[PDB]
Design a protein around this nucleic acid. Structure first.
Ligand code: CA
Ligand code: CA
Ligand code: K
Ligand code: K
Lengths: 300, 295
DNA sequence: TGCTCCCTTGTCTCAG
DNA sequence: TCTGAGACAAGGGAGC
């Protein structure tokens, strides 16, 4: 996630009738789904329960989901971190629950959100389902938020209403903080938007700071906004060095590690036998339950 | 004022209808009225100090309060250390002339008006203290009437017994509170606000016990959490903690201890009609509308 | 030389 | 002069 970015983006959110998503293929970001389900229960096989509940919600509206998972963790994402777990079984048995629903999946090389962004650019999907805001910085758009509680978000609306483009968002993160960077102490959603509007880019921002700190003549012209921003930056002891902004943060967002495979996904059909004989064994579900749920799913 | 003190005291307050204050002798803390009338009225409005003091005076008299006003004199060095248009001599003698014509007694405190106010009570020259300055409690103030000149708020009565009964805070508890929270006399410890400062007193009894525990260690749940909190704010508890000086300036401020009763005299219409016309152009007709009821 | 809302942010806890 | 929410506190600014 990028800190408080949903707060900034949210006023561009637009509602969407769940009906209208019929036959739309979606990249579903489930990189953290199992983890969440482990930590939000007052229980065992919650991931299977949680996955199933959600899978049925996607199918109920004719969504053609393709599930994506996490691979490795990128270098930048690690060095920023140093400053009940996920078992391969739990993973396998939800991928298995997908296959038996006929739902395809991939495991991303690195970050899932990055991958989802790639598939959408490759015309392999028509929408991306996630609650992770980093998807915007990786180039993603047509985001569907709060699918499981619905808010449509896209790069156009952000550009057109907030004036933020791809470069702007990658830079906002370097103020607000994110998985790739620590941000600037003192800069939250309001100030970081003020800075980008006023200074245009982080390189311009830093010159104004350094120059002003190197020769006090430079500040003589400064308006109220700049004057008050200086003290704040100073009282928080902000040093803006060579690696501000980071070319590495930029590159990591603009060229994330992703699968560029153009081969389309295949969507099968929910195998009522294997599904009923999965729920029964892993959860203890009688057939009369799964069939009441699944039969209207197969035949609509 | 002691930082955040009014939020700790707040639930101990009991509301007051103004009609219940008739004939009570009332020390008024006018120490900052002039500087505020300048800062708070404009469109800086000329002679706001006169109009300001005028309205407030009449409000006190409408409810039959016999007030005695108290102005700042000096500024204690410990206050000057801590911090590390204008109010003119004419404004002061102007509002004080007005007070004299109303037949209202007034004094100028050796130092802090709040402290003098607390003293006046302690000597039974008055029956209550009208101020909004939380520092008054540390000066041993009590029977304190807050919000007397709001605006949105109603008026709240505070006293040292309620505070002790409800909150478990005596005067020494409060003087040490002000060293966790900061005030005019100390900047306090950073990261210690109302909630946790209160908890420290109720667990350690005093800043001495609080220190030992923190230093004896820096060389359970609550104590470990607090220690992480203190360390991450980088708190230094030296020999000056708590401070005898802060303690002395609150327990023994400089005040006039004269036991001589004040004397309230009737307002003088003719004199008052004159003053307003000279300063503000208020015709005798207008003044009579406000004044004659009050005689 | 006011002091107080209240906005903006930083840390931490807690639970869905 | 895992995220989201929410509780606590620092640190400002704008206004009677
Ligand atoms: Ca992410
Ligand atoms: Ca005071
Ligand atoms: K930040
Ligand atoms: K404090």
């Amino acid at each position: 996630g990028v800190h408080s970015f949903w707060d900034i983006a949210g006023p561009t959110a637009r509602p969407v009738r769940l009906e209208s998503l019929e036959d739309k293929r979606m990249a579903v970001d489930a990189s953290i789904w199992i983890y969440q389900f482990l930590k939000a229960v007052r229980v065992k096989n919650s991931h299977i329960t949680g996955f199933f509940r959600r899978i049925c919600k996607l199918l109920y509206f004719g969504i053609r989901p393709v599930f994506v998972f996490d691979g490795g963790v990128p270098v930048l994402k690690r060095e920023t971190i140093r400053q009940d777990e996920v078992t391969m079984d739990m993973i396998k048995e939800v991928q298995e629950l997908l296959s038996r629903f006929g739902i395809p999946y991939i495991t991303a090389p690195m970050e899932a959100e990055a991958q989802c962004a790639e598939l959408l650019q490759l015309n392999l999907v028509d929408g991306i389902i996630t609650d992770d805001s980093d998807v915007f910085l990786f180039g993603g758009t047509k985001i569907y938020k709060n699918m499981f509680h619905v808010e449509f978000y896209d790069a156009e609306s952000i550009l057109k209403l907030l004036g933020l483009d791809r470069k702007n968002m990658i830079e906002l993160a370097q103020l607000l903080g994110s998985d790739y960077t620590n941000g600037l102490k003192g800069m939250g959603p309001v100030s970081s938007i003020e800075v980008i509007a006023e200074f245009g880019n982080l390189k311009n921002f830093k010159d104004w700071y350094n120059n002003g700190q190197f020769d006090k003549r430079k500040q003589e012209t400064e308006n109220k906004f700049e004057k008050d921003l200086r003290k704040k930056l100073v009282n928080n002891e902000i040093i803006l060095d060579d690696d501000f902004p980071s070319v590495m943060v930029y590159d990591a967002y603009m060229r994330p590690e992703v699968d560029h495979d153009t081969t389309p996904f295949v969507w099968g059909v929910p195998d009522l036998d294997m599904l009923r004989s999965f729920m029964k064994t892993q959860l203890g579900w009688p057939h009369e339950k799964s069939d009441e749920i699944l039969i209207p799913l197969i035949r609509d």
